[PDB]
Structures are given as C-alpha cells and as structure tokens.
Amino acid sequence: PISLIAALAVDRVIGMENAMPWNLPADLAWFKRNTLDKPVIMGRHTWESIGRPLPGRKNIILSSQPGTDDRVTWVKSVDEAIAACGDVPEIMVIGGGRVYEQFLPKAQKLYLTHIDAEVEGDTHFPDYEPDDWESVFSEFHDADAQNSHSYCFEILERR
Ligand SMILES: COc1cc(Cc2cnc(N)nc2N)cc(OC)c1OCCNC(=O)c1ccc(C(=O)O)c(-c2c3ccc(=[N+](C)C)cc-3oc3cc(N(C)C)ccc23)c1
Ligand SMILES: NC(=O)C1=CN([C@@H]2O[C@H](COP(=O)(O)OP(=O)(O)OC[C@H]3O[C@@H](n4cnc5c(N)ncnc54)[C@H](OP(=O)(O)O)[C@@H]3O)[C@@H](O)[C@H]2O)C=CC1
Ligand SMILES: [Mg+2]
Ligand SMILES: [Mg+2]
Ligand SMILES: [Mg+2]
C-alpha cells in the first residue's frame, strides 16, 4: 500500500516559503522515476507550490475546503485520499510536512533523498525512529553541472 517520498536537507529541512530551498533536477528525476504510473497524494500547500497536475499519475489533493481545479481529485480526509487511489500496488505520498506527519504511521516504505546543503526552512520532515527502518538501497552522487549539491538516494523498509 503506502510509501512516502521526500527530499531532506540537513536537519530534515524540506521547505521554505512554500518551495524547496534548493534546485536539484537529479532529485526531481528520481521522484519521477519512483512515482510514474502510481497515485500521488499531496497536501494543498504542495499542490499550490507545484502549480500543475503531475502527468502520468492520478493526482489526489487533501483540503478541508471545496476543490478548486477540476483536473485533479480533491478529498477532505486521509481516509478519502486512500479510497481515491483504488486497489493499486503502491500509493505514493509526496508531501508536504503536515501530510507526511499523518501518513508516516501508515507507511511501509520511505524513499529519501539526503541533500548536503545547510539551508533555512520553515517545514521539516517528521522525526522518524531509525531503529524501525531497514535501509535496503542507497546510492551516493556528487554535485555536477546540473546539481549544485551532493546528495544520496535511500529506500527504507519498515522493520
Ligand atoms: C516534480 O516537482 C516537484 C515535486 C515535489 C515533491 C517531491 C520532490 N522530490 C522528492 N524527492 N520527493 C517529493 N515528494 C515537490 C515540488 O515542489 C514542492 C515540486 O516542484 C518542483 C518544480 N520544479 C522546479 O521548480 C524547478 C526545477 C528545476 C529548475 C531548474 O533550474 O532546472 C527550475 C527552474 C528554476 C527554479 C528556480 C528559479 N528561481 C528561484 C528564480 C528559476 C528557475 O528557472 C528555470 C528556468 C528554466 N528554463 C526553461 C529557462 C527551467 C527551469 C527553471 C525549477
Ligand atoms: N521532498 C520535499 O522536500 C518536499 C517539500 N515540500 C514542501 O513542504 C511545504 C508544504 O508543507 P506543509 O506546509 O506542511 O503543507 P502540506 O503540503 O502538507 O498541505 C497542508 C494542507 O493540506 C490539507 N490537509 C492536510 N491534512 C488534511 C486532512 N486530514 N484533511 C483535509 N485536508 C488536509 C490542508 O489544506 P486546507 O488548509 O485547504 O484545509 C492543509 O493546510 C512546502 O514548503 C513545500 O515546498 C513539499 C513536497 C515535497
Ligand atoms: Mg509561480
Ligand atoms: Mg526522495
Ligand atoms: Mg540553519
């Protein structure tokens, strides 16, 4: 069922002023590879930050208020969000901080990008207990012409 995918800078920073405080196209490529052809659930702030439907994925947006874009599916609770996914091999929760906090107890997999950048944030990833998770995949990358920081990809499975 349920996986979280997120990019974390130092001290678990994920956001500032409704954007990610870095520019790493390599992370966005990894995000696309790991979410294409799967339903994605996101909070209203994250939907507004992205500003457009993500192609090739059913887009499900959480909000307490009526929906404002007929191109995507709007739901008023976590229960309704999961129901909107139907029966699929894997549901991807794609942010932001408030949505991660509610779905982390339900998640069996974490797809994490660890970014070597010290940046200010106003939103953090929830503090998960590392003893509850087994790292099943990791991959390290240096900065390059397109990616100003080094970063590492990791997949954790719930023990
Ligand atoms: C899928 O996307 C997103 C996914 C997620 C969830 C998510 C992500 N990851 C992981 N792991 N888990 C997750 N759950 C969250 C998102 O947001 C919260 C998000 O949205 C990001 C959208 N992408 C960019 O915004 C983006 C990415 C790369 C670039 C880039 O520079 O290449 C640019 C870019 C600019 C960025 C900032 C800027 N200024 C500040 C002035 C000016 C820019 O000018 C440009 C001019 C160009 N041209 C053609 C001239 C071309 C590009 C740019 C923009
Ligand atoms: N990997 C990364 O680094 C990522 C970072 N981000 C960043 O995260 C930040 C956004 O996170 P955050 O501010 O916590 O906001 P969220 O994106 O988590 O959206 C929160 C909103 O979602 C709606 N919502 C949440 N839970 C529920 C529920 N149970 N029922 C109904 N509606 C619900 C509410 O909308 P309403 O007010 O309409 O009721 C709420 O205000 C941004 O800075 C963004 O750039 C986002 C994605 C990935
Ligand atoms: Mg804009
Ligand atoms: Mg990731
Ligand atoms: Mg600081």
UniProtKB/Swiss-Prot annotation:
The strain K12 sequence is shown. NCBIfam families: PRK10769.1 (NF008037). Pathway: Cofactor biosynthesis; tetrahydrofolate biosynthesis; 5,6,7,8-tetrahydrofolate from 7,8-dihydrofolate: step 1/1. GO terms for biological process: 10-formyltetrahydrofolate biosynthetic process; dihydrofolate metabolic process; folic acid biosynthetic process; folic acid metabolic process; one-carbon metabolic process; response to antibiotic; response to methotrexate; response to xenobiotic stimulus. One of its GO terms (cellular component) is cytosol. The gene is folA. It catalyses: (6S)-5,6,7,8-tetrahydrofolate + NADP(+) = 7,8-dihydrofolate + NADPH + H(+). Changing residue 85 to A: Decreases catalytic rate by one third. Increases catalytic rate about 7-fold. Pfam families: DHFR_1. Key enzyme in folate metabolism. Catalyzes an essential reaction for de novo glycine and purine synthesis, and for DNA precursor synthesis. Keywords: Antibiotic resistance, Methotrexate resistance, NADP, One-carbon metabolism, Oxidoreductase, Trimethoprim resistance. Changing residue 20 to L: Increases catalytic rate 2.5-fold. Increases catalytic rate about 7-fold. Belongs to the dihydrofolate reductase family. NADP(+) binds at residues 7, 13-19, 45-46, 63-64, 76, 95-102. GO terms for molecular function: dihydrofolate reductase activity; dihydrofolic acid binding; folic acid binding; methotrexate binding; NADP binding; NADP+ binding; NADPH binding. The keyword Oxidoreductase applies. Its EC number is 1.5.1.3. Substrate binds at residues 5, 27, 52, 57, 113. It is an enzyme of class 1 (oxidoreductase). Residues 2-158 form the DHFR domain. This is Dihydrofolate reductase.
